[PDB]
Amino acid sequence: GSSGSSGLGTLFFSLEYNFERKAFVVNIKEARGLPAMDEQSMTSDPYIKMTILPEKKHKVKTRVLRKTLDPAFDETFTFYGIPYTQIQELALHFTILSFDRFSRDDIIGEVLIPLSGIELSEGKMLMNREIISGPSSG
């Protein structure tokens, strides 16, 4: 058992659709307030995992920073085939894990952003999400 543990920073990102080429673009900004994992210099190499839900096909992840509770990947992935109209049936699953050799899977938190309703038509929009202990009563 346990009780007491603050952290789970935030996750910044901006969705974008290559309307020109009718394509999807999921840019992953940076994450602030990342809880340290390594017990060396009070730091870690966290990384946000990208996934196009539900499909979950197009699987991509953002570069794995090196020692930084506030890494900035500001990555971007393109995708073609999306009829756009399906965007409302998509969802970017941002998993805030923590990599540190020895194959370590420490999901700091789980983030989800259902494009179901979102309007990218206008253009690119900035969005943020809070990192908590899974989507369980919150």
From Swiss-Prot:
Q: Where in the cell is it found?
A: Cytoplasmic vesicle, Secretory vesicle, Neuronal dense core vesicle membrane
| The protein, known as | Synaptotagmin-4
Q: Where does Ca(2+) bind?
A: 100, 103, 106
Q: What does this protein do?
A: Synaptotagmin family member which does not bind Ca(2+). Involved in neuronal dense core vesicles (DCVs) mobility through its interaction with KIF1A. Upon increased neuronal activity, phosphorylation by MAPK8/JNK1 destabilizes the interaction with KIF1A and captures DCVs to synapses. Plays a role in dendrite formation by melanocytes.
Q: Record's superkingdom?
A: Eukaryota
Q: Which family does it belong to?
A: Belongs to the synaptotagmin family.
Name the gene behind this protein. Answer: SYT4
Provide the tissue specificity. Answer: Expressed in melanocytes. Expressed in brain. Within brain, expression is highest in hippocampus, with substantial levels also detected in amygdala and thalamus.
What the entry says about domains is: Unlike in other synaptotagmin family members, the first C2 domain/C2A does not bind Ca(2+) neither mediates Ca(2+)-dependent phospholipid binding. An aspartate-to-serine substitution in this domain inactivates Ca(2+)/phospho-lipid binding.
Which segments constitute the C2 domain? 8-128
* Residues represented out of the complete protein: 154 to 278 of 425
